[PDB]
Design a protein around this ligand. Sequence first.
Ligand code: K
Ligand code: K
Ligand code: MG
Ligand code: MG
Ligand code: MG
Ligand code: MG
Ligand code: MG
Ligand code: MG
Ligand code: MG
Ligand code: MG
Ligand code: MG
Ligand code: MG
Ligand code: MG
Ligand code: MG
Ligand code: MG
Ligand code: MG
Ligand code: MG
Ligand code: MG
Ligand code: MG
Ligand code: MG
Ligand code: MG
Ligand code: MG
Ligand code: MG
Ligand code: MG
Ligand code: MG
Ligand code: MG
Lengths: 71, 44, 177, 130, 215, 60
Amino acid sequence: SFRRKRASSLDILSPKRAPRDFYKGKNCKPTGFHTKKGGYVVQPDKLPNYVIPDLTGFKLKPYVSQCPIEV
Amino acid sequence: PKRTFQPSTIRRKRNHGFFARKATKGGRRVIARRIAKGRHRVTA
Amino acid sequence: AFRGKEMMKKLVKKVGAENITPELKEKLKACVPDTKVVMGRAKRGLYAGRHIQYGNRVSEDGGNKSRRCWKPNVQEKRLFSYIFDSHIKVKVTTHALRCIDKAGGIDEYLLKTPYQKMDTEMGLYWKTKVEARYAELGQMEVAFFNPEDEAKLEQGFKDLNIAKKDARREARRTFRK
Amino acid sequence: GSRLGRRVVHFANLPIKLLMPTKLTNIHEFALRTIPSATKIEIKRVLESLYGFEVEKVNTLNMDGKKKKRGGLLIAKADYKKAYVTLKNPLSISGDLFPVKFIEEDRKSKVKGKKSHWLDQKERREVGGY
Amino acid sequence: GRARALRQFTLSTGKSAGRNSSGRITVFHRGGGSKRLLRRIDLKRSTSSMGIVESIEYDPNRSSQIALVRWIKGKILEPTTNTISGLFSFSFLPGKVDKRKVTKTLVKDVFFSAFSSPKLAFASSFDFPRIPVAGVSTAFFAPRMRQKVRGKSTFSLYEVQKWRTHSIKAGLSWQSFRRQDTLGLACKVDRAPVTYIIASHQLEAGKMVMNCDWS
Amino acid sequence: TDTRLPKRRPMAHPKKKRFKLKPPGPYAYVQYTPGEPIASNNPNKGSVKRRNAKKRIGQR
RNA sequence: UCAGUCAAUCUACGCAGAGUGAAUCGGUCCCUAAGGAAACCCCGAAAGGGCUGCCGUCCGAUGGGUACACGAAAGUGACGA
RNA sequence: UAUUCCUCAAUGACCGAUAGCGUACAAGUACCGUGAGGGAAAGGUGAAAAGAACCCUAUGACGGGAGUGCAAUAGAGAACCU
RNA sequence: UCCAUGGAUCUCCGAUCGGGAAACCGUAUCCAAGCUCCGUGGCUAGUCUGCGCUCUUUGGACUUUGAAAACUUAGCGAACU
Ligand SMILES: [K+]
Ligand SMILES: [K+]
Ligand SMILES: [Mg+2]
Ligand SMILES: [Mg+2]
Ligand SMILES: [Mg+2]
Ligand SMILES: [Mg+2]
Ligand SMILES: [Mg+2]
Ligand SMILES: [Mg+2]
Ligand SMILES: [Mg+2]
Ligand SMILES: [Mg+2]
Ligand SMILES: [Mg+2]
Ligand SMILES: [Mg+2]
Ligand SMILES: [Mg+2]
Ligand SMILES: [Mg+2]
Ligand SMILES: [Mg+2]
Ligand SMILES: [Mg+2]
Ligand SMILES: [Mg+2]
Ligand SMILES: [Mg+2]
Ligand SMILES: [Mg+2]
Ligand SMILES: [Mg+2]
Ligand SMILES: [Mg+2]
Ligand SMILES: [Mg+2]
Ligand SMILES: [Mg+2]
Ligand SMILES: [Mg+2]
Ligand SMILES: [Mg+2]
Ligand SMILES: [Mg+2]
């Protein structure tokens, strides 16, 4: 969907259009910590866990029927 | 011939950036003047 | 300019606005100094109301006028304090030093001078501290002794000094051993 | 309860938009579009838990939205993130699903313009990137 | 480099080229030399020692020469008194006679709370003032708080004081006392002490060097 | 059943530099062999140099 | 239709869609230089200026680093033509 | 008693698109400058879009007929009253 | 659809938890109290008691005041003419 912006919003610095050592980031959540040697360690307690129950045999549906039944 | 504008993004942000203007009393008046005028680009 | 109001705002924000009744507000309005002090170094010393002045310097024959200033006679001194038993390093004008001479010392000057005339938040702090220590001293009494007790206690102190010296030397030599 | 983990999600809302692959049989990887604040671990765990995929690796890249400028007026679309997911076993897509046949028939309109040896494999793994 | 200086006595400093803290030139015709490192030299020589001159080296920072030198030497019954000859009470030293607090809130209480700590006192930091005892200084005195009911006369040796004769201190500061009120807010065989000194004329390796102290 | 232990995060408190840990005074206690002259630098088996430079040479 | 030193079917031109895959590449991260700034202290009609250390903090590559954390009276990292 | 970053109502021998605020129109925009800063242009079809089906000649109708409409040189694609 | 009142959700900078090339990065604050679930230790073993964290409620510890046109009161204060 096309939406209107200001033409002055092109001046905000982004790492795609910056020198090679510019870092901004995209507000992702962190999962670990930086090392002193330029690496990274992923702490497994900070990873998201998803609780998705079993959907097989469920009787409800995305839409509700609109057949003429009663006032 | 070598012209006068030789671009460098880090130099531009270090001289006319938001936190470079916010650091001294003259630049804070510049920011107030720009906002009062109504400029779209308040800082460089 | 409105120094009384800007000091009263800080004092209210420190002490809590709920703590003060309107009569206490009315009384506190008449202790916070409302003087005209602009220069920075007069808020850090005891100047007794002297300030800088900017005026004209006028030539003798031509009458030509150019700007100049008169500064107060600021000197850095150490003044002795009776309840702290020690010196206080201040930057006083000679006018303040002469007022101290008339009052009878820096402590007596701080007691005698009211709150509005202290001109300074540090002046209020120092007057408050000296008044609290003098109120502490106001509830104490000393008892003197007869010369026979003088001699007895002198002998006791000699005994304890020589015993402490002997025990300290013995402990040092045994720790060496 | 809360002792199970620090980050437990009961109502996920990560939007995943699948891109139509080139071939219908022997699919070894597929691409998708999502919001820029998604992570490789989030995409892999949502795809494993919600749909039942057997995910091997996830590779991401950022894209800028499309823009149009007409001298002062600027209109634009939102930024997105593209992800490549590699499967452990090949999958397939039936032709009878809408709009697969229309996509293939419109794609072939734009592009109009034997010696097998011993021990030669047929369906080899076709994975790009690093 | 042929002979790197000893790494325990080498410091790094830049060049000023005659420019002060403001960045402007104050000393003219300087700048653009060769790179130098600073050597640390013992210019005091206050420690009395004996040494052996090891080597004579080159110092670019000064006109003379320096020399590396290793150094080869260097429960009793207390007199409880119940008799007092007189009581003096400091009740006019405040200058205004008033009662003692433990209630309306007063100006003095407001100024005490506004300047008090973030979260009796006649001891530890400052102790008893000398003024109290000024009419007669060489007399043993016992300070005590004044009680509403008449107190006891028993005085041990620990409770009696006398400024000797030594005292007939430190010094506070007018503007920096509030912060301080606010809480304060031979070695082993493989080692050898060495120093750098300014070498004299006719001083080569293997010689003796003395530092002498007052006698 | 992993008895192995996870890696730990570095702490962010300020750390003292080695120049301030040296005792004060004029004297420096250097390594001394009692028949040999005093060397200014004593590298051992773990003193490696120019690692980034060798990386660049290999890349070229 | 505009632009291209064209009357252009073509195009870096208009419309629509697509395209950039990293433990190792380049950064982020750690460490500092020249330099900048806070705190403490010093000075100043105001605004502000100095000071970065004797016990002292945060940034700053054009340089030094690539599979835990804490401590150091151990070595070093460490260098010219 | 002083002033209007503001709100509500009213008035004008005030202006009427080179005028009135820099801006009646998506303007502190486009554009110029390293930066502080400077700074535009551009209103109107018809009562209602009924905005010209169809035919002929050109690569292509914006042309010549036909038709809508009081009127078609009232036939336009940020522009068509005189 | 719409209106009135009350609710649920309510990203980021300016900006104030620290750093900063504004719209980015890193962040379980700290300490007492009393409660369901949890695991482990110890007794002569039955309505037996004693140790912990995580998350929850109520307090108190550190600090985050803060913008704004003209008017007002003060400080310093020109030159063209
Ligand atoms: K007409
Ligand atoms: K004149
Ligand atoms: Mg928007
Ligand atoms: Mg790019
Ligand atoms: Mg963020
Ligand atoms: Mg990538
Ligand atoms: Mg052309
Ligand atoms: Mg043509
Ligand atoms: Mg073409
Ligand atoms: Mg094109
Ligand atoms: Mg790398
Ligand atoms: Mg520095
Ligand atoms: Mg500085
Ligand atoms: Mg400063
Ligand atoms: Mg800082
Ligand atoms: Mg750093
Ligand atoms: Mg670099
Ligand atoms: Mg080097
Ligand atoms: Mg106009
Ligand atoms: Mg006209
Ligand atoms: Mg016109
Ligand atoms: Mg520009
Ligand atoms: Mg037509
Ligand atoms: Mg008309
Ligand atoms: Mg912040
Ligand atoms: Mg105001």
